[PDB]
Design a protein around this ligand. Structure first.
Ligand SMILES: CNCc1ccc2c(c1)[C@@H](CC[C@@H](O)CO)[C@H](CNC(=N)N)[C@H]2NC(=O)C(=O)Nc1ccc(Cl)c(F)c1
Ligand SMILES: *[C@@H]1O[C@H](CO)[C@@H](O)[C@H](O)[C@H]1NC(C)=O
Ligand SMILES: *[C@@H]1O[C@H](CO)[C@@H](O)[C@H](O)[C@H]1NC(C)=O
Ligand SMILES: *[C@@H]1O[C@H](CO)[C@@H](O)[C@H](O)[C@H]1NC(C)=O
Ligand SMILES: *[C@@H]1O[C@H](CO)[C@@H](O)[C@H](O)[C@H]1NC(C)=O
Ligand SMILES: *[C@@H]1O[C@H](CO)[C@@H](O)[C@H](O)[C@H]1NC(C)=O
Ligand SMILES: *[C@@H]1O[C@H](CO)[C@@H](O)[C@H](O)[C@H]1NC(C)=O
Length: 335
């Protein structure tokens, strides 16, 4: 166990909050990265018990605390009011590095699921650029699996454990509040989502070989986890995914039961001033949305799912440690 330090390409001049935080908290990214390959060596990794996830989690909590100041912060009767200026918000990649006497082991097995022995290992000083995208159900702006789609879980037999689906080809999602001022929508090409869930059901089919795979909307709970939610240009977008997570995979083929028009799936979205905080139990109140068109163009690189004759998968998420595990699975800090 050691104390990592972050490395970024953040610009001092930029007023975007990730750049400001990284200018005084991270170091400039080394432009001459060194990677040593150890094909003979095999090491044991566990993406679900990784201290780098906890360190990145506290770093992004500090980033959000310094950057996205709410107008009112309510923690069980105690309300803290501050200045809540509208800021420029666009996540930047963050590399995580180990100090001297320590290194970062990197698993190059393109089929690795995060747990067990990895036979082709490498040694690096930092990880790749990881955008700290805080979202539920859909993992946005991440890295894609080089080979086949990968299914990751701490314990697939436990329906309470979050399932991380790592896609090998991205799905473009465009969310926009166009120029009620809290009504927004996302556009997703139904053809790409058809084939994506087609072979996500195939890979899930190998894990549960009867058991026709069925995709359904979140059972219940807080609005942040019952809808695909993400922060776009400093604004909080909550998007209904009932149409998106609506399909049945049976006899090797996928059928989408979600409503679609003109080959595109549209998710109704609402921008909410009142937010249930991911960083800690409590609520944060923010100012009304900025005037003009608020649009985010993102790539869906992963899915967060929960498993309930037939196996049903519903979108989950919330524990933002899982959003970091989807990118930190191939690393392990060793002395
Ligand atoms: C199986 N996992 C179950 C599960 C489910 C939901 C939640 C947890 C666990 C807690 C995780 C805590 C932990 O991580 C400690 O650090 C966390 C506690 N907080 C409150 N109940 N309010 C709580 N998460 C949230 O409610 C939350 O993320 N909302 C939110 C807002 C804005 C955006 Cl954009 C967004 F995408 C999400
Ligand atoms: C991942 O691979 C390990 C090592 O064989 C295995 O024990 C584990 O069950 C696998 N997990 C999943 C979800 O496939
Ligand atoms: C992605 O992975 C799936 C299996 O999970 C495979 O069928 C498909 O051909 C892959 N697509 C690529 C490599 O573009
Ligand atoms: C995983 O879950 C099953 C029950 O769902 C249990 O038998 C096992 O002990 C759990 N933990 C593991 C596999 O380490
Ligand atoms: C999503 O939309 C469906 C119908 O469009 C509705 O029944 C459901 O309550 C909505 N869910 C949320 C979380 O708003
Ligand atoms: C799938 O979407 C349709 C809308 O076309 C909806 O009526 C249905 O209830 C959805 N399936 C669910 C929520 O399981
Ligand atoms: C993903 O990246 C694109 C381009 O950099 C950006 O427009 C979009 O807002 C990002 N998505 C999120 C959720 O930050």
């Amino acid at each position: 166990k050691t104390t990592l330090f972050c490395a970024s390409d953040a610009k001092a001049y930029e007023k975007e909050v990730h750049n400001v935080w990284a200018t005084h908290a991270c170091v400039p990214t080394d432009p001459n990265p060194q990677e040593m390959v150890l094909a003979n060596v095999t090491e044991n990794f566990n993406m679900w018990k990784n201290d780098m996830v906890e360190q990145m989690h506290e770093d992004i909590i500090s980033l959000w605390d310094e950057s996205l100041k709410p107008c009112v912060k309510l923690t069980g009767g105690s309300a803290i009011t501050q200045a809540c200026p509208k800021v420029s918000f666009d996540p930047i990649p963050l590399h995580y590095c180990a100090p001297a006497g320590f290194a970062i082991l990197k698993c190059n097995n393109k089929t690795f699921n995060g747990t067990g022995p990895c036979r082709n290992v490498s040694t690096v000083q930092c990880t790749h650029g990881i955008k700290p995208v805080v979202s539920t159900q859909l993992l946005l702006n991440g890295s894609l699996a080089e080979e086949e789609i990968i299914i990751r879980s701490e314990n697939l037999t436990n329906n309470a454990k979050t399932i991380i689906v790592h896609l090998n080809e991205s799905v473009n999602i465009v969310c926009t509040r166009p120029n009620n001022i809290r009504q927004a929508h996302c556009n997703i090409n139904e053809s790409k989502w058809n084939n994506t869930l087609q072979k996500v059901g195939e890979e899930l089919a190998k894990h549960f070989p009867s058991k026709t795979i069925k995709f359904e909307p979140s059972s219940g709970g807080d609005l942040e986890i019952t809808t695909h939610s993400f922060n776009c240009r400093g604004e909080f977008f909550y998007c209904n995914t009932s149409d998106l997570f609506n399909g049945t995979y049976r006899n090797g083929t996928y059928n989408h039961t979600g409503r679609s028009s003109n080959g595109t799936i549209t998710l109704q979205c609402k921008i909410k001033q009142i937010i249930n905080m991911w960083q800690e139990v409590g609520r944060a109140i923010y100012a009304p949305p900025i005037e003009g068109e608020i649009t985010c163009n993102s790539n869906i690189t992963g899915l967060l799912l929960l498993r309930d004759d037939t196996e049903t998968f519903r979108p989950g998420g919330g524990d933002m440690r899982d959003n970091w595990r989807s990118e930190l699975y191939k690393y392990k800090v060793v002395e």
